[PDB]
Amino acid sequence: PQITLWKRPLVTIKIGGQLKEALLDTGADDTVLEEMNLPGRWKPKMIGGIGGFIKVRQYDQILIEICGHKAIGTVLVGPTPVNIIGRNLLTQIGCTLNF
Amino acid sequence: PQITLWKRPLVTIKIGGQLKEALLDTGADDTVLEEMNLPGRWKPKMIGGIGGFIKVRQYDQILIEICGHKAIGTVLVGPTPVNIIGRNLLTQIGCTLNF
Ligand SMILES: CCOP(=O)(COc1ccc(C[C@H](NC(=O)O[C@H]2CO[C@H]3OCC[C@H]32)[C@H](O)CN(CC(C)C)S(=O)(=O)c2ccc3c(c2)OCO3)cc1)OCC
């Protein structure tokens, strides 16, 4: 679809068998999701933005459905204030910015 | 234009008469620029990101040209990791997300 930016670009996603709301975020290189107990191995990582860094768990090859579009890639899990869909998955659903 | 997301969506902006590089960021409500000298009155403000809150200088009704599209709105200056164009100005230049 076409999403305008008058309001925060929040969409429904499906991950690990669960439905969540998440932000379509062109400023995020990576996808960062709220604390969740996902199965499988993971690696520690730190990611930074305004205000400094947070500690996250990096899971690879995770399937996410974003408004009915499927994507597979790295997902970071940690104490983020909002679920963020970053460029690593936005490219997979063919998301572009248009002005 | 149509901007894909395999690379960071960096664009040239003009503000206070000077050219800078900035990231088009749909997950930012507000536009935040690194420390710079800007003419005009400003007020102290606080803004929160993934890592917590920072102190910024809020400049109101500032002229900013984003890839040759004019916007006039609020610009926050402070210790952001990178210059970010947020929805407050993305909406003025007519930006949407499409997939
Ligand atoms: C419940 C609300 O809590 P909150 O208010 C804060 O919530 C938040 C809302 C949105 C976001 C998304 C973030 N936007 C932002 O910082 O926007 C601010 C300017 O406009 C305002 O509007 C929103 C916040 C204000 C950017 O889009 C993306 N970021 C990178 C940018 C270059 C900075 S990233 O998230 O740092 C990040 C993500 C994935 C990565 C990574 C870094 O590195 C590699 O992978 C963060 C927090 O306070 C809590 C203390």
CA gyration radius for chain A? 13
Q: Which residue of A has its CA nearest to B6?
A: A91
Alpha carbon distance B49, B64 (integer Å): 23
Residue A88 host element (H or E) = helix A87-90
**Of B95, B92, B40, B35, nearest to B62 (Cα)?**
B40
Alpha carbon distance B29, B48 (integer Å): 11
Chain B residues with beta carbon closer than 8 angstroms to that of A52: 51-52
CB-based contact A86:B26 (threshold 8 Å): no
Chain B residues with beta carbon closer than 8 angstroms to that of A9: 26-27, 97
Resolution in angstroms comes to: 1.6
CB-based contact B5:B27 (threshold 8 Å): no
- Contacting residues for A93 by C-beta, under 8 A, at least 6 apart: A66, A67, A69, A70, A71, B99
Domain ranges of chain A: 1-99
**Residue burial B44-76, b: 16+ Cβ < 10 Å; e: rest:** ebebebbbeebebbbbeebebebeebebebebb
Is the dihedral angle over the CA atoms B88, B90, B94, B99 positive or is it negative?
negative
CB pair distance less than 8 Å for A50 and B25: no
Number of H helices, E strands in chain A: 1, 9
∠ CA A13-A9-A72 to the nearest 5 degrees? 35
> In this structure, what DSSP letter does residue A25 have?
-
Could you tell me the CA-to-CA distances from A37 to A11, A23, A61, A71 in Å, in that order? 21, 20, 16, 20
Active site residue A60: no
CB pair distance less than 8 Å for B1 and A29: no
> In this structure, what DSSP letter does residue A79 have?
-
Phi/psi zone of residue B40: left (φ > 0), alpha (ψ -120 to 50 degrees), beta? left
CB-based contact A96:B5 (threshold 8 Å): yes
Q: Which residue of A has its CA nearest to B90?
A: A5
Chain A, chain B: beta-carbon pairs less than 8 Å apart: 132
> How long is chain B?
99
Separation in Å, CA of A40 to nearest CA in chain B: 25
**Of B75, B84, B14, B65, nearest to B42 (Cα)?**
B75
Alpha carbon distance B49, B63 (integer Å): 25
CB-based contact B22:A27 (threshold 8 Å): no
Chain A residues with beta carbon closer than 8 angstroms to that of B28: 27
Which residues' Cβ are closer than 6 Å to ligand 1?
A: A 25, 27-30, 32, 47, 49-51, 81-82, 84, 86; B 23, 25, 27-30, 32, 47-50, 52-53, 81-82, 84, 86
The DSSP bridge partners found for residue B7 are none
CB-based contact B52:A54 (threshold 8 Å): no
Residue A90 host element (H or E) = helix A87-90
